Design a protein around this motif. Structure first.
Motif, PDB file in Angstrom:
ATOM      1  N   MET B   1       0.822  -1.205   0.000  1.00 56.33           N
ATOM      2  CA  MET B   1       0.000   0.000   0.000  1.00 56.33           C
ATOM      3  C   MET B   1       0.861   1.263   0.000  1.00 56.33           C
ATOM      4  O   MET B   1       1.797   1.378   0.791  1.00 56.33           O
ATOM      5  N   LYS B   2       0.545   2.210  -0.882  1.00 58.86           N
ATOM      6  CA  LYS B   2      -0.467   2.026  -1.919  1.00 58.86           C
ATOM      7  C   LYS B   2       0.076   1.183  -3.071  1.00 58.86           C
ATOM      8  O   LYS B   2       1.267   1.242  -3.385  1.00 58.86           O
ATOM      9  N   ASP B   3      -0.795   0.399  -3.696  1.00 58.07           N
ATOM     10  CA  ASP B   3      -0.417  -0.334  -4.918  1.00 58.07           C
ATOM     11  C   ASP B   3      -1.481  -0.172  -6.022  1.00 58.07           C
ATOM     12  O   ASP B   3      -2.688  -0.094  -5.707  1.00 58.07           O
ATOM     13  N   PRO B   4      -1.044  -0.095  -7.287  1.00 58.46           N
ATOM     14  CA  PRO B   4      -1.940   0.035  -8.441  1.00 58.46           C
ATOM     15  C   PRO B   4      -2.944  -1.109  -8.593  1.00 58.46           C
ATOM     16  O   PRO B   4      -4.066  -0.883  -9.047  1.00 58.46           O
ATOM     17  N   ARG B   5      -2.533  -2.320  -8.227  1.00 58.54           N
ATOM     18  CA  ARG B   5      -3.321  -3.516  -8.507  1.00 58.54           C
ATOM     19  C   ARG B   5      -4.643  -3.579  -7.738  1.00 58.54           C
ATOM     20  O   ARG B   5      -5.633  -4.119  -8.235  1.00 58.54           O
ATOM     21  N   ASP B   6      -4.657  -3.026  -6.530  1.00 55.53           N
ATOM     22  CA  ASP B   6      -5.868  -3.083  -5.670  1.00 55.53           C
ATOM     23  C   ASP B   6      -6.884  -1.983  -6.012  1.00 55.53           C
ATOM     24  O   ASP B   6      -8.025  -2.026  -5.507  1.00 55.53           O
ATOM     25  N   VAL B   7      -6.482  -1.018  -6.834  1.00 60.41           N
ATOM     26  CA  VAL B   7      -7.338   0.116  -7.162  1.00 60.41           C
ATOM     27  C   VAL B   7      -8.590  -0.300  -7.940  1.00 60.41           C
ATOM     28  O   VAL B   7      -9.672   0.259  -7.744  1.00 60.41           O
ATOM     29  N   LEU B   8      -8.444  -1.302  -8.801  1.00 60.75           N
ATOM     30  CA  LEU B   8      -9.545  -1.762  -9.643  1.00 60.75           C
ATOM     31  C   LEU B   8     -10.530  -2.659  -8.894  1.00 60.75           C
ATOM     32  O   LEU B   8     -10.166  -3.326  -7.926  1.00 60.75           O
TER      33      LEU B   8
END
Lengths: 44, 93, 275, 24
Positions: B1-8
């Motif tokens: 966190m933060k990571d791009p993958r969990d945003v979706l």
RNA sequence: UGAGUAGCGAAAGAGGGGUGAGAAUCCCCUCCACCGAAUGCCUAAGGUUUCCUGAGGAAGGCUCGUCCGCUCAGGGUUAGUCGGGACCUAAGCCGAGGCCGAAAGGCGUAGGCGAUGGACAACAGGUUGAUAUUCCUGUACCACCUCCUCACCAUUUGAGCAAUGGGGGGACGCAGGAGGAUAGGGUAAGCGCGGUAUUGGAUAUCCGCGUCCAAGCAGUUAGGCUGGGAAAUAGGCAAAUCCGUUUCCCAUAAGCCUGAGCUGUGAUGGCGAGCGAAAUAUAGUAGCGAAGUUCCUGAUUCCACACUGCCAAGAAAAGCCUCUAGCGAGGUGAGAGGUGCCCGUACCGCAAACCGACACAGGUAGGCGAGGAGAGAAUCCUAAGGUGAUCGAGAGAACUCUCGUUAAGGAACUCGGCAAAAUGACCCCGUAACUUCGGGAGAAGGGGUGCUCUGUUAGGGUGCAAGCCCGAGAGAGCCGCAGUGAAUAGGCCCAGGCGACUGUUUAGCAAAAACACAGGUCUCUGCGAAGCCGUAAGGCGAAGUAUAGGGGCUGACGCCUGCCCGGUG
């Protein structure tokens, strides 16, 4: 003819908002009466 | 966190969205607090596709009463990323 | 001068206006302009302490150093301008420093005349020099009560004052309507009575010009309800039967002194009420 | 289908002119 | 119970078919009707999905109902440029320390908040059952950043960046009148149409269309600078080659700043009247596509509060323009490469999506608002665009309401010419008492205006001409009861009381002889104010100063305003 209810969200918020009551101890008393009765919707 | 993958969240499967597939753009649900700049870094990592103009939209929930009990729907926030030309889709696959 | 209007309409029948002959330029210098929010006569609490105020035309203050703290530096009268704020006309004066300050304008001043603010300055009109140097009996205006405070006295148009003589402490002065006070000898003052004496002769001539002043209408007291005014009640134009004419506040107004019998200024009152 | 239904009633009021005259 | 009685909520529908168990009320087609300075659209407020598609329909539809703003399933708002926030400030509010107050708190600096304002870069078509100065096809624009590409420079003899500081500029009222141009309308030309069977027109016939932006570039309507150059500076907290001021030089314009809107570029692009397929999940599109000029007419819009005049002299700051202080070793000047976020975007907003218990004859900024006649956003009829405004059928009683008519009479009615009728549109003739000389005064009282010709008049607008228009005056003629023929756009003459007038007043019984006003007068008030709002602090009065403010009384103007101080103040 014109009637007493002429809604304006800025007015309802500035006058009847939670912080309008936080601004004074009397409003804190209003919130206290609001919470002791267990109302689901405090303030406006 | 933060990571791009969990945003979706999930892809938006609609007839309006399927038409956008030929537009080289793909709708996806996104977190309410997420910004456009974050979404641009997500596609570049997850899909690896170059990113152009991203659009994002929020929706107020509709009422969905069940008998006596009314209740507001959760606020979805889909995003539209217009992918650059010559880029394989990973959608449906 | 006064330009009488022909009675083309009912409001024309009496209205009159001053010649504005003294005025030279249409606009004030930008540098000395100041804002004037109209209180409307209300208290900071929001209640109306003063009756029938506000609703007038918008006004913008021009900076005016009545104090004239600088000295020994010659000036020059470049222009004269109208002042909405008061009956007295304003006359701009260019200092040799290049400094510019609007200043109260005594009548008979000419454009471009030199004016020194110093003690050594000549008696000639527009000059301001300390009372000790002032010859007895010469007319004086914009008198300060204390040095450095500004001249609260004699600011309105057409008013004048005269010196009855002087000691080391204090110089005598004839205030308008004949009252006299021992004003401080060290205190500064300006020779020559204020101009625009014709302002008193001006006739409004209609209710509409009063709105621009803006002087709000005042209801007669007898007309008022008895709860609101002491002279109220009665069956149509009630006689002032109640003892002692009165303000809506309980203090009587006709011939009743409002003075504090004990006051710091009482020692200075050599003379009072000449009528 | 639940087919839930609700009914609400209110008293309201009022006038009182009352348009009554005499005896005086 | 009253009752199957009141009501069914202003104000056009008719027919053909279609759907379906069921059709007056739903859908489609053809006529017709109503709004059209809107019953039209665009967008706030507010509502918060009521928008869309496919179904259902018991209830909510003042009635049935296949239909809904209903009930169920999915679907629908896309922004560096629009609005707001990463800019500013007004009223006002909050408010460190602080000033005060039994307590709670009150007041108020620094500072901050706060648009209804100021600053600010994207315009044209296309697209869906929707959302589009957001998606798309074109052309662009602002700000910021250098792995970059060139050009110019300078190493404290300093190329440049230049402030939280100083000035400049931003920066503002009302009314009026010329001018320039345009959004818009119409004419002659041009291109696509049709020869019309109801008498007659290949004809001065008919129908329809007549173009296109922000910008990057050039100049022009024209306005504003009052001048620019040099020297000197007790000043603008320090400083300033900046400003202000002073002294000379040259002043009939070199020069300085801003312009609407035009011509070509933006466009070898697309709008466009009309053709209108395969067929697909037979809606109707895809797709093709001509002319695209000229004159007249033009503002309530823009140049712009620009000009003139006037008083009641008419916001605040930042964004910007400069100056130095101060930072400096690599910076500037142009191209390429990229970056540009957070919220509001649906629909209803003259309304059945809101204020009104209702799907209610009322109430709701502002921005566009056409044609014929006309002074006109008057009035009537019609474009663009909508609306068939959701209980009906038929008899043609009283009676109630909204109106039209009226024989002979007239206000004999009545508290009272209440109501109604009549007058009213432009041009011309003409006009009294009285008066403050402005008025009264559309006084009153009359006449003429319809159509045709001499007359594309006389005279003017624009134009090289050609032409389009604004248009009297007249003469001769024709008609009808009629002539601003419709519709809307004063009824007057008097005599008195009261009130100068305009204005204001009990929203929801009384609008006035009441109130107020200018004026007149008395009284009080010398600033740390008299009067006040407050326990106080603070503040109003007042960024005022006895020709100024507070209070009482009287009410424009004219003639005036007598006597009494014993009593009560």
């Amino acid at each position: 003819m014109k009637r007493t209810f002429q809604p304006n969200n800025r007015k309802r918020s500035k006058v009847h908002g939670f912080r309008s009551r936080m601004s004074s101890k009397n409003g804190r008393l209003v919130l206290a009466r609001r919470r002791r009765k267990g109302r689901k919707v405090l303030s406006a | 966190m933060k990571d791009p993958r969990d945003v979706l969240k999930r892809p938006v499967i609609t007839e309006r969205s399927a038409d956008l597939m030929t537009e080289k753009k793909y709708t996806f649900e996104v977190d309410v607090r997420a910004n456009k700049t974050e979404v641009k870094d997500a596609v570049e990592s997850i899909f690896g596709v170059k990113v152009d103009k991203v659009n994002i939209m929020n929706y107020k929930g509709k009422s969905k009463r069940v008998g006596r009990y009314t209740g507001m729907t959760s606020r979805r926030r889909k995003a539209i990323v217009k992918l650059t030309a010559d880029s394989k889709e990973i959608e449906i696959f | 001068a006064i330009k009488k209007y022909k009675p083309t309409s009912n409001g024309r029948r009496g209205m009159t206006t001053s010649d504005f002959a003294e005025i030279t330029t249409d606009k004030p210098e930008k540098s000395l302009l100041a804002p004037l929010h109209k209180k409307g006569g209300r208290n900071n609490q929001g209640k109306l302490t003063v009756r029938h105020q506000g609703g007038g035309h918008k006004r913008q203050y021009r900076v005016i150093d009545f104090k004239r703290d600088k000295d020994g530096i010659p000036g020059r009268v470049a222009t004269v301008e109208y002042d909405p704020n008061r009956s007295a006309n304003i006359a701009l004066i260019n200092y040799a420093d290049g400094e510019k300050r609007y200043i109260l304008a005594p009548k008979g001043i000419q454009v471009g005349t030199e004016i020194m603010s110093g003690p050594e300055a000549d008696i000639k009109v527009g000059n301001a020099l300390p009372l000790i140097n002032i010859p007895v009996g010469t007319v004086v205006h914009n008198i300060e009560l204390k040095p450095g405070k500004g001249g609260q006295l004699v600011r309105s148009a057409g008013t004048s004052a005269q010196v009855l003589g002087k000691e080391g402490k204090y110089v005598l002065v004839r205030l308008n309507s004949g009252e006299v006070r021992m004003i401080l000898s060290a205190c500064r003052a300006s020779i020559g009575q204020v101009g625009n004496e014709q302002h008193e002769l001006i006739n409004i001539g209609k209710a509409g010009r009063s709105r621009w002043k803006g002087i709000r209408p005042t209801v007669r007291g007898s007309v008022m309800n008895p709860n609101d005014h002491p002279h109220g009640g009665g069956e149509g134009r009630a006689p002032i039967g109640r003892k002692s004419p009165m303000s809506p506040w309980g203090k009587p107004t006709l011939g009743f002194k409002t003075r504090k019998k004990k006051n710091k200024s009482d020692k200075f009152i050599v003379r009072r009420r000449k009528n | 289908i639940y087919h839930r239904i609700t009914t609400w009633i209110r008293k309201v009021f009022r006038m009182n002119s009352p348009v009554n005259d005499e005896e005086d």
